[PDB]
C-alpha cells in the first residue's frame, strides 16, 4: 500500500506527533506505549501505510514511519518516556542547544548539523517502504526549529526525491498573541519553503483551535494536550483514506488529495475543519447527522484557521467523510446546498473531492473532515506579511538572523516571496470572483 | 495441431504458472523472466514481435515494482528487449536498449559483470551494422577485457570476442589486426574440445582466417584454412 | 498386504507425527483414531470405529513422544505400541545399538510381534529414521538386524534421513551413517535416502515461509505414503512393496533410492508434473548429476492421473533422463497409479530413482569417515561402549564396496 | 527424563549456583525464594531434569538436585538467606575453617572430612533420580575448596559411578591478576582431576567475563553478580536441551553433548560463548538475527576464556540455539560460512552439534550458546603451566601443600599430568593443522 512518512519537526510538530501516533496506533488497534499489537491477532485496517513490520512473530512491535526531529532534547525525551518501544529510537533524533525562535539555527545552523543524520533516516524509511507516496511533515511555522528545520528539511527532501508529495501539516502563528517574539519573521522565512518546495502546507492556527475546544469541546482552558488532539483528529482524518482498505473506502493518496486541492503551483495552502466537534462526554442523542455536520463544517468558527472562511472564496474543497454512513444520496446533496451557500471560485466549476472511509474514528462514529483550499488563507498571511513589515522598517531584532549566515538581500527576497504568495490568492480571488 | 502451436501452448502455461506464482509471491520475478524468454522466442519465430515485446515489458514492470531494486535483473531484461529489436530489424532501437542496459549497470556496481560484457559485445555488433567502426571497436575491447578478467584467456567467450573483432577489422580492411584477432581466437578454440564449444565455431575461425590470409596475399595459408574448415564441416556428419 | 511401521529415533518419530497425521488424512480419519480405501494397511482395526495404527514409536530421549502423546494425538497411538526409555542413545551408535539398544530390543521385538500376530497379511516395514543420530541410526541399525533375523522373507523398507552435506548437525555423524548403512545394506530390501539439505530447499520453494522439521517431514511423509499408496489406494498398475525390490534394485547392493514428490486442493495439468517429478532439483538427496546415470527410476502418479498421458509425457521424460548403458531405450522406468490423491492435492507424483548419484552421498560419508576414523577422532565413544575399530572399519569396507558398486553400475 | 545434578563446590561455584538456580527456577516458572511454583499450575518445561517433587500437593516446593559444598560457612549461609525453603538444607553442607587457597585442604583435609557427608547426599539425589545422566559440578580451578574439593569430589564420583558424565563447569584463573597467590598451583592440582576423572571441564575466565559485561552489557564495573550471570545464562543455555521437551527441541543429554565434543579422552576442556550479549535495557530494534548472532559468537572477544579463539583451531564445536527461530535454513548456513571462516581441525571433517530449544531464555528471546572445544584452551593452560614453573623453580610457598600430606614427587607428577594435558592439544593442533 502507499506508504507515508510522518516527519515531526520542532516542539509543536512533535507534540502533535506525540498525540498523532497515540491516535493512529489506537486507530489500528496497536498499543501506543509498546508498539506491539494485541497478541496473535492482526492490526485492524491497513497498518503498512504508516507502520513497518519489526519482528516477524506477528506479536512484535510495529515501528511507525516517523522521524522526530528537534534541536531541544526535552521534547523527544518526553516522547521516549511516553512511547516506550514504539518508535525506532534511531529516528528519535535530538540535540542539546535548541534553536529558540531563530530561523537561521534550524535552517542554517544546528539544523544543518542534523541534516546528514535526518536524511540518513528518511533514506532508511523510504528504502523500507513498498512505494512511498507522501511525506507529512508536522511542524509549526512559528519557531526556530519547526519553521527553521522544517523549511530546511522539505527543501532537502523534494530536492532529493521530488516525485513525492510533501504535505507540511503545520501550525500557523496565532494572531491573538505571538508565542515567539520573532514569529512573524519565522513564518515568512518558512513561507519560502512551504510555498516553493512543499506540495501543500496544511495550516492550523492556535487561536481557532482554542475556540474549537472551548466553545465546541466545552472545556474552560484548552491545553496543548487538546490543541494537539483537534489537529490530530483532523490529521488522523485526512489519513484515514490512506490507511484503510474497507468496504467502499475512497482510497485517497496524498497525490490523489493534492491533485484535487492544488489548482496551480502557488495555491497550496490548505485549511482544515472537523465535524462533529461534539465533546467526548457521550452526547449520544445529540450526535449529528450528515445533513447537519456539513452545516457545522462550514461555520466561520469551525475551521482550524484564524481567517473567516465563508467571508472569502473556497477555491478547492475536499470533504473527507469517515465512518459509518447509512445515507449516500443524503451525502453529497447537503454539499449541493453547500455548492450554493459557500463562496466558490468559478475559475473552477466544481470542486468537492469526497472521501468515504467506512472505518470509523476513535472519538467519533460519523466523523467528517474538511480540506478547503481557501483564498482567505492569504488573509492569515496578510497579517504575517504586515507584522513582518513593522519588524523590518525598524530592521528588528538584531544581527540574530544576520550573524548566522543570512543576508539583508535574502530576507527581502523571502518577504517578496511571501508577497508573491499573498498576491497569488489575491490573483485568485478577484479572478475567481 | 502444428508443432509450433504445441510449443506455444506449453510455453504459455509455463508463463501463466510463473505469473500466478509472482501474484502469490511478488519477489519471484527472475523465474517469470526465464519463462517469458522461451515464450517470447516462439512468438518471434511466428513473427508476432508485438506479443514478444509485451511479454518483456511485463517482465520489466514487475522488476521495476520490486521494493529492493535489482539493477542486474533490469540490465538483463533491457538486453532481452534489445535482442528482440535486433531480430525484428529495428537496429536503432536495439542499440538504444543495450545502451539503457549498460547505463543501469554503470550506475550501480555492475560494470564488470557477465551480462555487461555480453551486452557490450552485442552492442558493438550493432554499431558495426550502423557503420560506426570506432564505437564498435571500443565496445568490443571492453567486452574482451571483461571476459579476460572473468573467464581465463582460455575460454569460449574470449575467443568469440576475438572472432567478432576479427570480422570488424576485416570488414574495414585492417587486415593485420584481423589476422591477430583470428589467430588468438584459433589458439583458444583448439584447446577447448568438449560441449564447452561446438566444432562449427572452429570452422568459422578457419573460414575467417582464410579470407584474411587471402586478403594478405598468402593464398597458400588461405587454402589450407578453407580446407581445414571443409574437413571439420564434413566430420560432423560422422 | 498390511504394512507395519517403525519409527525409531527423534528424526523418525518426528516423521511419525507428520506421517500419521497424513495417513489419517488420506484414509479420512480423525486424530483420535476413529472414522471421520484399504484402511487395513496402516491401521489395525481394534473396534468398529477406532483404527489404531500399526506403528511402534520406538524411542530413546522420551520427550519426542511427549510432544506426540501430550498435545493432540495421545488417543491415537496404542501405548503397548511404543517404548520410552532414558538415557537417550547419546548420538552414539554404540549406545543405540549395544548399550541402550539391548535394553529395549526385547521390548521392541515383542511389540512388533504383538503387532504382526494381529496380521492377517503382513508384507512390509516402513521403518522410518535417520542415519545420522544415535537412536535412529544406532537402534535403527539394531532393529533392522533383529527384524530380518525374525522375518527373513518380508520386505523391510528403510526411510532414512542422510546427514546433510551442508554442515554436520552432529559431530560423530559420519560415523553413525556407515555403522548404519552397513546394516541397511545387509538387511533392508530397499532404502529411501532423504537429505535435509534438499528437504530445506524444496520446502523453501514450496512454502512462502522458512521451514522447520515439521514442514520438512511433510515432504517425507508424502513420500512415505506415496510409496505405499498403490498398495492401499489400488487403482491401475498395482505396485506393491515386492515390486520396489524386483524393479528398482538391479544388483544385490544398489537399493538406496532417491525419492521426489510433485506437485511442489492443488491441481496440476500433468505434462509438467512429470517435468516436476523428474526435476533434478526436486529429488530429495544431494546426488551427483554431472557424473551420474540412473539405474532404474519409478513413477507413482496418484490421483487424477490417467495412463494415456505417460505414453507422451513419461516417454519424453525418459529420453531426457540419463540411464546406464545396460538399460533399454524406452524401458528402465516402472510406473504405477493410485485412484486417490493425498488430501490437499488432486494429482500427485513420486519417483523412486535408483541412481549412481547416491554413491556421491556414500562417497561423502566415506571421505568424512576416511579422515575421522584413522585419527580416532570420535572413536573412543564407540570403543568404551562396545564397538571396536575392527567392527567399524568392517562397516567402511562394505560402504566403500557399495560406493564402488554404483561406479561398477555405470 | 534425564536427571542432572548440579554440585556446587567452593565459593566461586556456589555463587554461580546461587545465581544458576535463581535462573533455572525462574526459567521453569518457579519462585526462586520459596521453591514452590505458582499455586495449582504445573511448572513450564520439564522440571524433573533438575528438580524433585517434594510434597504431592502440586503447590509444594520443588527441591533442586543440587548439593552446595564449601568449607567456609559464609557462602552457603548467604544462599540460605537468599533461597528460603528452595534447596534441601541437608544438601547445603558447610564447615567452619575453610580452605584458603590450599588445595591440600579441600582435597586431603577438611574436604576429606565432608566427603562421607557429601557422597551420602549425592547418593540421596541419584537414588531419587529416575535415571541420572550427568553431573554438572560448579567450581573454580583457582581456590582451595572449589579446585581442592572439586578435584576430590569428581575423583570420588566417577570412581564410584563411572557410567555418568561429569561436566565440571569451572572458572579458570584470570591471567590479568591472580585472585589467589597459590592459584597457578591449585589449577594444576585440579588439572589432574579435570583431565583424568572428569568427562569434560567447561572453563570460564574472569578476565573475559569482565570484558563481556563491560563492553557488551555496557556497565562500568561488572560485579560478581554479573560474572555469575554471564556464566549462568550460558549454564542455563547448555542445559536448556536437557530440561525442555518442546516443539522441535533437540534434546541433548550431557553424554549426547560430550560424544560430540570430546574427541579423545584428553581433549575435553571446552570453552563457551553466548549470544546475544545485548544489555537488558530493552534494545528491541537492535535485537540480533541469527545471521549476525553467529557473527558475534565467534569474535575473539566473545568467548568466556582468556585465549583468543579464532587465533587457534576449533576442534569440536556445538552451537546451541535456544529460543524462537523462524529460520531453519538461514540457521546452519550462517555456520556454513563459519565452516569456512573459522579455523577447524581436519582430523575432523565437520563438527557443529546444533541444538534447538523452542523455549526461550529469560533475558533473551533468540539466544545462542556456543561450546567450542578449542586448541587454544591449552594456551590458557600454557600460562598456568608457566606460572607453576616460576613457582616451582623457587619451590614456592612453603610446606603448606607438603605438610597436609602431599609429596614433592606427587606435585611433579601433576605438573607433568598438566604438561601431558597442554601437549595433548599441541598434539592435536599441528596434527589438526
Ligand atoms: N498545536 C500546537 N502548537 C504548539 C504546541 N507547542 C507550541 N506550539 C506553537 O508552535 C509555535 C512554535 O514553537 P516551536 O516550533 O515548537 O519552537 P522551536 O522548538 O524553538 O522551533 C509557537 O507559536 C506555539 O504557539 C503544541 O503542543 N501544539
Ligand atoms: N527430516 C528430518 N530430519 C531431522 C528431524 N529432526 C532431526 N533431523 C535430522 O536427523 C539427524 C539425526 O538426528 P536423530 O537421529 O534425530 O538423533 P537421535 O534420535 O538422537 O538418534 C540430524 O542430523 C538432524 O539434522 C526431522 O524432524 N525431520
Ligand atoms: N565467576 C565467579 N568467579 C569467582 C567468584 N568468586 C570467586 N571467583 C573466583 O574463584 C577463584 C577461587 O575462589 P574459591 O574457590 O571460591 O576459593 P575457596 O572458597 O577458598 O576454594 C578466584 O580466583 C576468583 O577469581 C564469583 O562469584 N563468580
PDB file of C-alpha atoms and ligand atoms in Angstrom, chain C residues 9-11 14 91 130 132-136 161 169 173 196 199 213 217 220, chain D residues 256, ligand 2:
ATOM      1  CA  UNK C   9      14.909 -42.089  16.746  1.00  0.00           C
ATOM      2  CA  UNK C  10      13.941 -38.438  17.163  1.00  0.00           C
ATOM      3  CA  UNK C  11      14.160 -37.998  13.378  1.00  0.00           C
ATOM      4  CA  UNK C  14       9.094 -36.542  14.218  1.00  0.00           C
ATOM      5  CA  UNK C  91      24.099 -39.547  19.486  1.00  0.00           C
ATOM      6  CA  UNK C 130      17.746 -41.162  10.145  1.00  0.00           C
ATOM      7  CA  UNK C 132      22.582 -39.587  11.471  1.00  0.00           C
ATOM      8  CA  UNK C 133      21.969 -39.817  15.167  1.00  0.00           C
ATOM      9  CA  UNK C 134      22.383 -42.488  17.799  1.00  0.00           C
ATOM     10  CA  UNK C 135      18.821 -43.584  18.303  1.00  0.00           C
ATOM     11  CA  UNK C 136      17.624 -43.517  14.708  1.00  0.00           C
ATOM     12  CA  UNK C 161      17.420 -39.192   6.507  1.00  0.00           C
ATOM     13  CA  UNK C 169      24.311 -31.181  12.716  1.00  0.00           C
ATOM     14  CA  UNK C 173      27.521 -38.205  12.434  1.00  0.00           C
ATOM     15  CA  UNK C 196      17.792 -32.338   4.941  1.00  0.00           C
ATOM     16  CA  UNK C 199      14.398 -31.074   2.233  1.00  0.00           C
ATOM     17  CA  UNK C 213      11.414 -30.039  10.657  1.00  0.00           C
ATOM     18  CA  UNK C 217       8.743 -34.040   7.126  1.00  0.00           C
ATOM     19  CA  UNK C 220       8.913 -37.138   3.608  1.00  0.00           C
TER      20      UNK C 220
ATOM     21  CA  UNK D 256      24.884 -36.604  23.991  1.00  0.00           C
TER      22      UNK D 256
HETATM   23  N1  LIG E   2      13.810 -34.719   8.038  1.00  0.00           N
HETATM   24  C1  LIG E   2      14.007 -34.526   9.351  1.00  0.00           C
HETATM   25  N2  LIG E   2      15.277 -34.559   9.829  1.00  0.00           N
HETATM   26  C2  LIG E   2      15.504 -34.381  11.147  1.00  0.00           C
HETATM   27  C3  LIG E   2      14.355 -34.128  12.058  1.00  0.00           C
HETATM   28  N3  LIG E   2      14.873 -33.964  13.280  1.00  0.00           N
HETATM   29  C4  LIG E   2      16.220 -34.111  13.154  1.00  0.00           C
HETATM   30  N4  LIG E   2      16.586 -34.381  11.889  1.00  0.00           N
HETATM   31  C5  LIG E   2      17.924 -34.689  11.409  1.00  0.00           C
HETATM   32  O1  LIG E   2      18.203 -36.075  11.687  1.00  0.00           O
HETATM   33  C6  LIG E   2      19.566 -36.247  12.010  1.00  0.00           C
HETATM   34  C7  LIG E   2      19.709 -37.277  13.123  1.00  0.00           C
HETATM   35  O2  LIG E   2      19.236 -36.869  14.391  1.00  0.00           O
HETATM   36  P1  LIG E   2      18.470 -38.044  15.225  1.00  0.00           P
HETATM   37  O3  LIG E   2      18.606 -39.412  14.507  1.00  0.00           O
HETATM   38  O4  LIG E   2      17.067 -37.474  15.470  1.00  0.00           O
HETATM   39  O5  LIG E   2      19.184 -38.191  16.644  1.00  0.00           O
HETATM   40  P2  LIG E   2      18.735 -39.409  17.595  1.00  0.00           P
HETATM   41  O6  LIG E   2      17.230 -39.586  17.543  1.00  0.00           O
HETATM   42  O7  LIG E   2      19.291 -38.973  18.988  1.00  0.00           O
HETATM   43  O8  LIG E   2      19.328 -40.681  17.060  1.00  0.00           O
HETATM   44  C8  LIG E   2      20.094 -34.904  12.440  1.00  0.00           C
HETATM   45  O9  LIG E   2      21.320 -34.666  11.715  1.00  0.00           O
HETATM   46  C9  LIG E   2      19.011 -33.895  12.083  1.00  0.00           C
HETATM   47  O10 LIG E   2      19.513 -32.937  11.129  1.00  0.00           O
HETATM   48  C10 LIG E   2      13.028 -34.109  11.460  1.00  0.00           C
HETATM   49  O11 LIG E   2      12.047 -33.903  12.162  1.00  0.00           O
HETATM   50  N5  LIG E   2      12.931 -34.295  10.139  1.00  0.00           N
END
